[PDB]
């Protein structure tokens, strides 16, 4: 099945995802003396303060930390959102050396990872539903650069060693995602998808300006994971990142 080597990467991903070449995939380059301020946007509510994190999980591309969503109590609303998306899951895409791993760029520039954090529009009932919804997600994106550690990462990165492989999960209760955000929540916003198959483009995006800095050795540790399942050869579970897609005259909106 899909996957990020040389037989199952990126660009095979259309034969069985043809969305993989439609009109408002990503991630995309941020060319940011094209992107425009937007009056209109309002003020982004990141409201992080009731999250209930469940598990951590190896699901054979990267790891997804996982959040009770059957109530309100991890939502983003505001911004260029409608009414309000609840937190389901989050993880990361990185690289096998530090400059590279990113899936968004900025002015072609890749970072040494991104964080993903998935919300899905209430209106919906729930995921699998919002999903077929072209307003169905929202994702806020952050950027990870190496130099000083992450202290809100640290807890992910002790418990990588217990899910070093595909299928493997741990209980992760009590994870605070409020340990993972830069300072600013200055953004960028565009409509978009799924960066992994299905890639449903029911996606919008808000990409924070900061990134986070992270050590060498917590990204290292990120990369002693594996992509492959118990007892199977070691594949290092490096580069999951889908690289930039075609724009394609969407218009990418500055909050600031
Ligand atoms: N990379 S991503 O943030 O666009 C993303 C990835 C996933 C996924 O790769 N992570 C999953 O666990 C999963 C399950 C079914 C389909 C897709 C996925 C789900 C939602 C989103 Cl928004
Ligand atoms: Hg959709
Ligand atoms: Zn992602």
């Not at 986070?212 to 594949?235: A, C, D, H, T, Y």
Request: proline share 7%.
């Amino acid at each position: 099945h899909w996957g990020y080597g040389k037989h199952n990467g990126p660009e095979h991903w259309h034969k069985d995802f043809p969305i993989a070449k439609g009109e408002r995939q990503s991630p995309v380059d941020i060319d940011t003396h094209t992107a425009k301020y937007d009056p209109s946007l309002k003020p982004l509510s990141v409201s992080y303060d009731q999250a209930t994190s469940l598990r951590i999980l190896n699901n054979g591309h990267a790891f997804n930390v996982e959040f009770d969503d059957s109530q309100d109590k991890a939502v983003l609303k505001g911004g260029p959102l409608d009414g309000t998306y609840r937190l389901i899951q989050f993880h990361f895409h990185w690289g096998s050396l530090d400059g590279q791993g990113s899936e968004h760029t900025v002015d072609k520039k890749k970072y040494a990872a991104e964080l993903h954090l998935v919300h899905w529009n209430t209106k919906y009932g729930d995921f699998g539903k919002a999903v077929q919804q072209p307003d169905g997600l929202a994702v806020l994106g952050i950027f990870l650069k190496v130099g000083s550690a992450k202290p809100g990462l640290q807890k992910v990165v002790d418990v990588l060693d217990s899910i070093k492989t595909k299928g493997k999960s741990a209980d992760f209760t009590n994870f605070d995602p409020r340990g993972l955000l830069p300072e600013s929540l200055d953004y960028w916003t565009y409509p978009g998808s799924l960066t992994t198959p299905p890639l449903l483009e029911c996606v919008t995006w808000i990409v924070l300006k900061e990134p986070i800095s992270v050590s060498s050795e917590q990204v290292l540790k990120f990369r002693k994971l594996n992509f492959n399942g118990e007892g199977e050869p070691e594949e290092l579970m490096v580069d999951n990142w889908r690289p930039a897609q075609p724009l394609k005259n969407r218009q990418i909106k500055a909050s600031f």
